[PDB]
Amino acid sequence: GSCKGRCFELCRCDNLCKSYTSCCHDFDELCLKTARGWECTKDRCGNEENACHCEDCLARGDCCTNYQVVCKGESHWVDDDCEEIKAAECPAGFVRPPLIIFSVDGFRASYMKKGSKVMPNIEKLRSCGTHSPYMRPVYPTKTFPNLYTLATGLYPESHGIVGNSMYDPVFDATFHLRGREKFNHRWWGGQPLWITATKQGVKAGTFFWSVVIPHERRILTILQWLTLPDHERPSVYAFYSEQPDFSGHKYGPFGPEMTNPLREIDKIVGQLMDGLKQLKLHRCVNVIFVGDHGMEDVTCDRTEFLSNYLTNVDDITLVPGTLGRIRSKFDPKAIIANLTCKKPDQHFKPYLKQHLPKRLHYANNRRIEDIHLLVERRWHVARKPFFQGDHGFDNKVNSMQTVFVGYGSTFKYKTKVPPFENIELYNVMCDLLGLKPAPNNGTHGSLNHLLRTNTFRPTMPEEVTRPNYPGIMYLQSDFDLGTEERHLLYGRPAVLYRTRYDILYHTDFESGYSEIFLMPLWTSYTVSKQACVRPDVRVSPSFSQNCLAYKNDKQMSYGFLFPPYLSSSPEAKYDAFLVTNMVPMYPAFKRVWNYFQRVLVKKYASERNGVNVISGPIFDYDYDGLHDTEDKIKQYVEGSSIPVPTHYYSIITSCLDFTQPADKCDGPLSVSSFILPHRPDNEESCNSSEDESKWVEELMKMHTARVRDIEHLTSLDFFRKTSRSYPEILTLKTYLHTYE
Ligand SMILES: *[C@@H]1O[C@H](CO)[C@@H](O[C@@H]2O[C@H](CO)[C@@H](O)[C@H](O)[C@H]2NC(C)=O)[C@H](O)[C@H]1NC(C)=O
Ligand SMILES: O=C1NC(=O)N2Cc3c(c4ccccc4n3Cc3ccc(F)cc3)C[C@@H]12
Ligand SMILES: CCCCC/C=C\C/C=C\C/C=C\C/C=C/CCCC(=O)O
Ligand SMILES: [Ca+2]
Ligand SMILES: [Ca+2]
Ligand SMILES: [Zn+2]
Numbered sequence: 001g002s003c004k005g006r007c008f009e010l011c012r013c014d015n016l017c018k019s020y021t022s023c024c025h026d027f028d029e030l031c032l033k034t035a036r037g038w039e040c041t042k043d044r045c046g047n048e049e050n051a052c053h054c055e056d057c058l059a060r061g062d063c064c065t066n067y068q069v070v071c072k073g074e075s076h077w078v079d080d081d082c083e084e085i086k087a088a089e090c091p092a093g094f095v096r097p098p099l100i101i102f103s104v105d106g107f108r109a110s111y112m113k114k115g116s117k118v119m120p121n122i123e124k125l126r127s128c129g130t131h132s133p134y135m136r137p138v139y140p141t142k143t144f145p146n147l148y149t150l151a152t153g154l155y156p157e158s159h160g161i162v163g164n165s166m167y168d169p170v171f172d173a174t175f176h177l178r179g180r181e182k183f184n185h186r187w188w189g190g191q192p193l194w195i196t197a198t199k200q201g202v203k204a205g206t207f208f209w210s211v212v213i214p215h216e217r218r219i220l221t222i223l224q225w226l227t228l229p230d231h232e233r234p235s236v237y238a239f240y241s242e243q244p245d246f247s248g249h250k251y252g253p254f255g256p257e258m259t260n261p262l263r264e265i266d267k268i269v270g271q272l273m274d275g276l277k278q279l280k281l282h283r284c285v286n287v288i289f290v291g292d293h294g295m296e297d298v299t300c301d302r303t304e305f306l307s308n309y310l311t312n313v314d315d316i317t318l319v320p321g322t323l324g325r326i327r328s329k330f331d332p333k334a335i336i337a338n339l340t341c342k343k344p345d346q347h348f349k350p351y352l353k354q355h356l357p358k359r360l361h362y363a364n365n366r367r368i369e370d371i372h373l374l375v376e377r378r379w380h381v382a383r384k385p386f387f388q389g390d391h392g393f394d395n396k397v398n399s400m401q402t403v404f405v406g407y408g409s410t411f412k413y414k415t416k417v418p419p420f421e422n423i424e425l426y427n428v429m430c431d432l433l434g435l436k437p438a439p440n441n442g443t444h445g446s447l448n449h450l451l452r453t454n455t456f457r458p459t460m461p462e463e464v465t466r467p468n469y470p471g472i473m474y475l476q477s478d479f480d481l482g483t484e485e486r487h488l489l490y491g492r493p494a495v496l497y498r499t500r501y502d503i504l505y506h507t508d509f510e511s512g513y514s515e516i517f518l519m520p521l522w523t524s525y526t527v528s529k530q531a532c533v534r535p536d537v538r539v540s541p542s543f544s545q546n547c548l549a550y551k552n553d554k555q556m557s558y559g560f561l562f563p564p565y566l567s568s569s570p571e572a573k574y575d576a577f578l579v580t581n582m583v584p585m586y587p588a589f590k591r592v593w594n595y596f597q598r599v600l601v602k603k604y605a606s607e608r609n610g611v612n613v614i615s616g617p618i619f620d621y622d623y624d625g626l627h628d629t630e631d632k633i634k635q636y637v638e639g640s641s642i643p644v645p646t647h648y649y650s651i652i653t654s655c656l657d658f659t660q661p662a663d664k665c666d667g668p669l670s671v672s673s674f675i676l677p678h679r680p681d682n683e684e685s686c687n688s689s690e691d692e693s694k695w696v697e698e699l700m701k702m703h704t705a706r707v708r709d710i711e712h713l714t715s716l717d718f719f720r721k722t723s724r725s726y727p728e729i730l731t732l733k734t735y736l737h738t739y740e
Contacts (some may be wrong), residue, residue: 001024001025001240002024002025002026002030003023003024003026003030003031004026005637006024006028007027007030007177008031008178008217008221008224008225009532010205010206010225010232010234011023011024012027012547013027013031013168013209014206015206015209015213015218015221015413015574016195016206016208016209016210017207018210018211018212019208019210019211020183021670023205026115026576028214030110032053032212032213032214032217033049033050033051033155033529034214034614035049035050035051036050037051038051038052038064038065038216038271039063039064039066039070040052040054040063040066040067040069040070041070041248042070042073043183044068045071045421046124050092050190050215050254051064051108052064052065052220054067054070054071058200058278061223061224061227062220062224063278064276065219065220065223065270065271065272065278066271067278068277068278068293069274070349070461071572074208074277074278075268076274077121077124077270077273077274077276077282078120078121078124078270078273078274078278079184082124082128082414083283084156084413085283085408085409085413086625087397087409088283088284088286088408088409088410089283089369089409090258091280091281091303093229093230094230094284096202096235096434097284097285097286097408097409097432098226098234098235098236098237098281098284098285098286098307098433099235099236099237099285099286099288099429099433100222100236100237100238100239100272100286100287100550101207101237101238101239101288101290101429102238102239102269102272102283102287102289102290103147103150103237103238103239103240103241103288103289103291103292103294103482104240104241104243104244104245104265104289104290104291104403105143105240105241105242105243105244105246105291105292105293106143106155106243106244106245106246106249106291106292106293106294106295107132107244107245107291107294107392107403108248108253108291108294108295108399108401108402108403109133109135109242109293109294109401109402109403110253110294110398110401111132111244111253111258111262111403111455112126112403112424114258114259114262114733118259118262118263118266118631119262119263119265119266120167120266121266121267121270121273122265122266122267122269122289122405123266123733124273124596125269125273125287125289125405125407126289126405127288127414127458128407128413128414129405129406129407129408129411129412129413129414129415129505130286130405130406130407130411130412130415130417130419130450131404131405131406131415131416132404132416132417132418132419132420133416133418133419133467134401134402134403134404134419134424134435135290135291135396135401135402135403135404135419135420135421136395136396136397136401136402136419136420136736137149137291137292137293137294137400137401137402137421137422138155138156138361138421138422138423139362139394139395140156140162140163140322140323140392140395141293141294141359141391141392141393141394141395141400142163142164142293142391142392143164143245143292143293144161144163144164144177144350145161145162145163145164146293147292148161148188148190148192148291148646149422150191150290150292150353150425150426151189151192151194151207151422151424151426152189152190152191152192152193152426152440152443153424153426153427153438153440154189154190154423154424154426154440154441155361155362155423155425155441156364156365157362157363157364157368158189158190158364158365158441159188159189160187160188160189160190160365160367161187161188161192162362162365162367162368163319163323163325163367164176164177165177165319166319166366167327167368168187168366168367169366170366171186173368175187177542179342183184184539190438190440191438192207193207193314193426193429193430194207194236195440196435196436196437197235197428197433197435200436202234202236202433202435203232203233203234203235204234204235204236204237205222205225205234205236205238205631206238207238207240208238208240209239209240215239215241215264215268216268216271218223218239218240218241218670219239219268219271219275219276222237222239222277222469222480223272223273223275223279223599225237226279226281226285227279236429236433239268239272240383241265241268243261243264243265244258244261244262244295245264245295246261247260247261247275248295248389249295249387249388249389249390250278250386250387250388251388251389252295252297252298252299252389253294253296253297253399254707255295255388255389259649262268262561269289272287272516275480278376278637280629283406283409284409286406286407286408286409286410286411286432286455287405287406287408288404288405288406288407288425288429289337289403289404290403290404290405290422290425291402291404291406291453292402292405293391293392293400293402294391294398294400294401294402295387295389295390295391295399296377296378296389296391296393296397296399296400297378297388297389297399298378298379298380298387298388299387299388299391300386300387300539302315302347302379302380302382303350303379303380303381303382303385304346304347304375304376304379304381304382304383304569305326305382305383305385306318306339306381306382306383306384307384307385308382308441309338309339309342310335310338310339313383313384314329315328315329315336316328316329316383317329318381318382318383319369319382320366320380320381320382320383321375321378321381321390321392321495321728322372322374322375322380322391322392322393323372323373323375323381323392323393324371324375324381325368325369325371325373326349326369326371326372326373327369328410329372329484330486332371333372334369335371336350336351336352337683339373339409339688340683342682344411344686345642346686347375347376347379347381348374348376348379348381349373349374349542349684349686350371350372350373351371351373351374351684352370352372353368353369353370353371353372353623353679354370354623355677355679355684356372356374357675357677357702357703357704357705358625358647358676358703358709358713359396359703359704359705359706359709359736360395361441361625362624364622364623364625374393374394375392375393376393377394377397377399378391389541393396396704396736396738396739397501397722397740398734398740399672401419402422404420404422404425406450406703408713409452410431410432410451410452410453411450411452412450412451412452412717413452415450415555416471417447417449418735420446420447420734421734421736423440423441423442424442424443424446424734425442426440426442426446426448427440427442427444427447427456428447428450428451431451431454431455432451434455435472435584443708443733443734444456444458445458445726445727446727446730446731446733446734447642448727449727449728449731451485455632458727458730459726460494460717460720460726460727461494461496461620461717463494463495463717464494464496464497464498465494465495465498465499465500465501467495467501467502467512468500468501468502468503469502469503470502470504470538471538472537472538473537473538473540474535474537474538474539474540475537476534476535476537478500478541479532479535479541479544480541480546481533481535481544481546481548481579482546482547482548482549482550482551483506484510484511484607486526486663487508487509487524487525487526487612488510488524488651489509489524489526489612489653489662489663489665490578490612490669490718490719490720490721490722491719491720491721491722492510492512492721493512493521493614493716493717493718493719493720494524494716494718495512495715495716495719496715496716497627497715499514499515499516499517500515500516501513501515501516501521502513502515502538502539504520504536504538504580506562506572506575507568507572507575508525508562508566508567508576508667509523509525509562509575509581510523510524510525510573511523511524511561511562511580511581512616512716513539513580515539515540515543516543516618516630517617517643518543518544518545518641518642518643519545519582519583519617519642520560520580520581520583520616520617521616521617521714521716522560522614522615522616522714522716523561523562523581523614523615523616524547524612524614525562525566525603525611525613525614526612526613526663527566527601527604527605527610527611527613528605528661528662528663529605529609529610529661531566531602531605532577533547533558533577533578533582534574534577534578535578536577536578536579536580536644538580539580544579544580545579545582545637545640545642546579546640546642548640549637549639549640549642550637551582551641552638553637554638554640556582556584556585556586556637556638557584557585557586557587557590557594557643558582558584558585559582559583559584559585559589559590559594560576560577560581560582561581561582561583561615561616562575562581562615563574563576563597563598563601564576564577565597565598566597566598566601568710576692582636582685583617583645583648584642584644584645586676586678586679586680588679588680588682589676589678589679590646591682591688591692591696592682592692592696592699592700593648593676594692595692595693595696596650596700599692599693600696600697600700601613604652608654608658608662608670609654609655609656609658609659609660609661609662610654610661610662610663611652611653611662612651612652612653612654612662612663613647613650613651613652613656614650614651614652614653614718615648615650615718616648616649616650616714617645617647617649618644618645618646618647618648618649618675618710618713618714619632619643619645620646620647620713621634621635621646624711625709625713626634626712626713626715627712627713627714627715628644628646644678645678646676646677646678647674647675647676647677647678647713648676648678649674649675649705649710649714649734650672650673650674651671651672651707651710651718652671652672652673653669653670653671654669654670654671655667655668655669655670656668656669656670658670666723668724669719669722669724669732671707671732671737672704672736672737673704673706673709673710673735673737674700674704674705675703675705675709675710675713676700676703677703682695685699687696693712701739703735704736704739705736705740706733706734706735706736707719707732707733707734707735708733708734717732719732
């Protein structure tokens with residue numbers, strides 16, 4: 001067959017044809033041709049063996065991108081001023097502004113420091129369009145998981161691409177970057193953007209490009225595709241390049257040999273932005289410049305070897321690198337424990353996947369091995385005993401952060417927006433295309449602030465179950481054991497599921513007591529900068545815990561949600577000790593909870609001018625990130641109907657303008673939050689032998705989390721009574737305090 005006239009169409013001649021070993025004899029010959037390169041000069045401003053031409057040129061659409069610069073005294077896009085775009089400016093027949101995605105492997109957010117002397121083109125877009133300081137990628141910080149994330153709006157665990165390599169026990173087969181297995185669709189869940197477009201009437205350019213097609217041919221092909229007639233022309237495109245990833249691996253992020261690759265990339269953007277101008281589309285198309293992950297210093301010698309910890313190490317399969325994954329070849333607890341805290345300077349930590357910090361959302365897929373290692377930034381982990389950079393580490397590490405830039409009619413003009421996570425982009429790009437997004441993990445409306453106009457105006461979820469407000473019904477003999485002004489500053493959480501619960505009023509605190517789970521869903525109370533279990537007479541004993549259960553539990557103890565130690569008058573403390581405030585806690589936990597309630601809260605209140613605290617339980621025995629229903633709960637207090645949480649949370653809110661007391665706050669809010677794993681021992685904190693001042697705060701930071709995360713795990717809805725706009729609040733709720 002032949003590719004005569006078929007090159008990079010939509011025996012094959014399309015841009016994946018190599019990747020499948022199946023292009024026509026003359027594909028290379030007719031389609032990949034390089035003579036005289038890709039930049040016009042005077043000498044040739046007057047064939048068919050060339051790569052781009054300099055007169056069926058603009059007409060047939062294979063000019064070199066510089067043509068009108070070189071041959072018609074037009075200024076490079078780069079050289080023109082920054083002109084705002086009040087509305088898109090498209091040729092007729094363009095029913096909507098096209099979207100072009102310029103993605104780059106391994107582009108670290110700080111590379112943008114390097115400046116317009118190396119990356120002027122890329123720098124015009126940032127300066128001129130919409131940008132943020134950096135973008136958070138997903139764990140694991142590797143190419144294939146983050147690209148599909150970007151394409152889906154989903155965490156890998158949901159989309160199924162949980163690593164560059166993976167084994168699916170139900171399929172019995174392994175996925176690799178090199179190989180033909182990846183091509184099988186069965187690996188791929190969610191709905192990538194190209195599929196969402198197609199289902200809704202919008203044609204898609206190809207999102208993948210074979211290795212062989214040089215970067216310059218990829219841009220020409222995209223620009224060519226924009227010249228097609230109305231009913232064949234796609235409205236969305238992606239360019240992809242494997243830079244800066246490739247050279248960062250060889251030279252390391254802080255290599256000065258990184259200037260050149262950043263130069264090369266900035267030239268390709270230039271081609272593209274020149275190329276658009278040439279077609280008069282440079283004020284039509286929205287462009288997204290976007291990375292998949294950062295890059296970090298990593299050298300051969302900083303490799304831990306499992307062989308140093310384990311006896312039978314030939315008994316295991318390790319996915320190695322900047323993360324570890326272990327399973328059996330053909331005792332889990334003994335391997336975990338054989339790797340728990342054996343050196344003072346150990347550069348990794350083992351986890352039962354369900355024990356990894358929830359913000360990672362990395363456990364709910366059968367391709368995620370129970371045994372997981374978090375390697376330390378700058379380190380490697382191998383099985384047994386060239387490059388200077390790598391990545392894949394925890395996605396809260398600064399070296400792993402990456403880039404976003406929006407530039408176009410729909411985007412905003414010279415606007416800076418706070419950093420955000422790549423799971424939010426899907427919704428946006430759907431907005432930019434008037435497409436209904438498929439269900440995903442982005443919170444729609446969190447990134448409306450990036451856009452001139454918004455077709456999507458978010459609304460608050462309807463409350464599902466209404467609260468009860470009980471008064472004194474019962475009398476203490478009936479049992480058998482053994483204010484909103486001050487404590488509820490953003491309205492009560494809305495319960496987004498079916499149960500029965502009560503609101504409880506007190507001098508020091510308010511709560512949301514569950515007659516089903518026998519404990520508060522939440523407990524809110526406020527602490528200023530300068531600052532025995534008895535029955536609760538409003539709750540039927542049938543829906544009340546008992547101390548008999550606890551006395552009878554060999555392991556389980558109990559704690560309070562609102563702390564006794566922060567009481568306001570000896571009178572008031574009697575409330576701290578109500579059965580309605582009491583929850584199950586392992587003593588290994590209590591140390592942690594106690595430090596938080598009795599040291600760290602008053603400290604947080606000194607540092608931020610008061611804080612509003614809402615704490616509560618979380619149950620996620622299935623580790624799917626969602627609030628558990630009863631059937632799922634696998635553990636109660638001995639002989640009782642009293643369920644044991646998997647984690648506990650707190651939400652800590654104040655005033656961004658810290659000159660204002662957390663309760664006399666008129667403006668934006670400052671929020672931090674955690675989800676602490678509820679475990680029988682403190683194996684996880686290698687320094688937990690010591691005073692709590694030497695390891696708790698470290699553990700807590702590791703388990704920082706977004707309020708949104710808390711909402712999923714609770715089906716509560718927070719912050720519904722403020723003076724801020726709802727889209728701002730979504731922002732507030734998507735925010736993660738990273739401590740990096
Ligand atoms: C991320 O979003 C995905 C899709 O919204 C969620 O997964 C869906 O879970 C719903 C239950 O709400 C199920 O009906 C579907 O089976 C799931 N679909 C897919 C494609 O996985 C997932 O729950 C979200 N993750 C978190 C932690 O919120
Ligand atoms: O090496 C590649 N060559 C190529 O054309 N590549 C795009 C590519 C890759 C990928 C892996 C998983 C899921 C989607 C993927 N894409 C498509 C894509 C491109 C840009 C995006 F913003 C999102 C997805 C790999 C990458
Ligand atoms: C619902 C999904 C619809 C189909 C698309 C889904 C998954 C991707 C399908 C095809 C493209 C995927 C990988 C192509 C490979 C690109 C890099 C070159 C491969 C190689 O180096 O040889
Ligand atoms: Ca006990
Ligand atoms: Ca669950
Ligand atoms: Zn890489």
